[PDB]
Amino acid sequence: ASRLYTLVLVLQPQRVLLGMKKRGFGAGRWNGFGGKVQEGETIEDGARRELQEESGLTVDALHKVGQIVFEFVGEPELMDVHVFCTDSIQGTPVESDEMRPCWFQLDQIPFKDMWPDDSYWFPLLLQKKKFHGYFKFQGQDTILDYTLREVDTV
Ligand SMILES: C[C@]12Cc3c[nH]nc3C[C@@H]1CC[C@@H]1[C@@H]2CC[C@@]2(C)[C@H]1CC[C@]2(C)O
């Protein structure tokens, strides 16, 4: 009862690209670029596709940095999110109907307007750590329970 997703962070030496979700689910929060993995696609190829489709960037190399399971109490399906990083991109971000991209300096990451779990694992991603996490939510705002650990192998 777990569904595969990817989440990709475009991370350069002193800045990160985030996209504000403009409409629909999770609207009003900044996030990386993510989506469902397709039948017949590897997780990595899904991550590349989601990044390119949502941001307009071309990614040349991607690195897996974490895996986070999300549970919403009462909802049967878990989200098994595979998190990736890249700093080897081409092109410029494209604003769309769905997504407004902005670059952020690392000291100005907008955690108050992100999913609350990000406050826990983003610092690990920024420090080039790898991790395994689990977050149990009640609705979209409240973390009931979590675990997070650093790993050498995702
Ligand atoms: C993985 C997300 C995004 C996120 C960033 N930091 N933390 C999170 C957790 C959050 C958990 C819910 C996910 C949501 C992604 C969009 C999902 C899968 C949504 C469920 C349905 C939808 C819109 O497809």
Curated annotation (Swiss-Prot):
Query: Cellular component terms, GO, for this chain's entry?
Result: cytoplasm; cytosol; mitochondrial matrix; mitochondrion; nucleus
Q: Where, in this chain's numbering, is O(6)-methyl-dGMP bound? A: 6, 21, 31, 115-118
Which residue ranges does the record assign to the Nudix hydrolase domain? 1-130
User: Known post-translational modifications?
Assistant: The N-terminus is blocked.
- Note the effect listed for residue 51 to P: Loss of activity
- List the EC numbers from the record: 3.6.1.56, 3.6.1.-
Residues the entry annotates as binding 8-oxo-dGTP:
6, 21, 31, 33-36, 115-118
Mutating residue 46 to M has which effect?
Loss of activity
Cofactor note text: Binds 2 Mg(2+) ion per subunit.
Q: What is the effect of changing residue 45 to P?
A: Loss of activity
Cofactor(s) the protein needs: Mg(2+)
Presence of the UniProt keyword Transit peptide in the record: yes
**Residues that bind 8-oxo-dGMP, according to the entry?**
6, 21, 31, 115-118
Describe what happens upon changing residue 34 to R.
Reduces activity by 97%
| Residues reported to bind N(6)-methyl-AMP | 6, 21, 115-118
Instruction: Quickly give the catalysed reaction.
Output: 2-oxo-dATP + H2O = 2-oxo-dAMP + diphosphate + H(+); 2-oxo-ATP + H2O = 2-oxo-AMP + diphosphate + H(+); 8-oxo-dGTP + H2O = 8-oxo-dGMP + diphosphate + H(+); 8-oxo-dATP + H2O = 8-oxo-dAMP + diphosphate + H(+)
The GO terms describing molecular function are: 2-hydroxy-ATP hydrolase activity; 2-hydroxy-dATP hydrolase activity; 8-oxo-7,8-dihydrodeoxyguanosine triphosphate pyrophosphatase activity; 8-oxo-7,8-dihydroguanosine triphosphate pyrophosphatase activity; ATP diphosphatase activity; dATP diphosphatase activity; hydrolase activity, acting on acid anhydrides, in phosphorus-containing anhydrides; metal ion binding
Q: What is the effect of changing residue 43 to K?
A: Loss of activity
For 2-oxo-dATP, which residues are the binding ones? 6, 31, 33-36, 115-118
Q: Report what the protein is called.
A: Oxidized purine nucleoside triphosphate hydrolase
Which gene does this sequence derive from? NUDT1
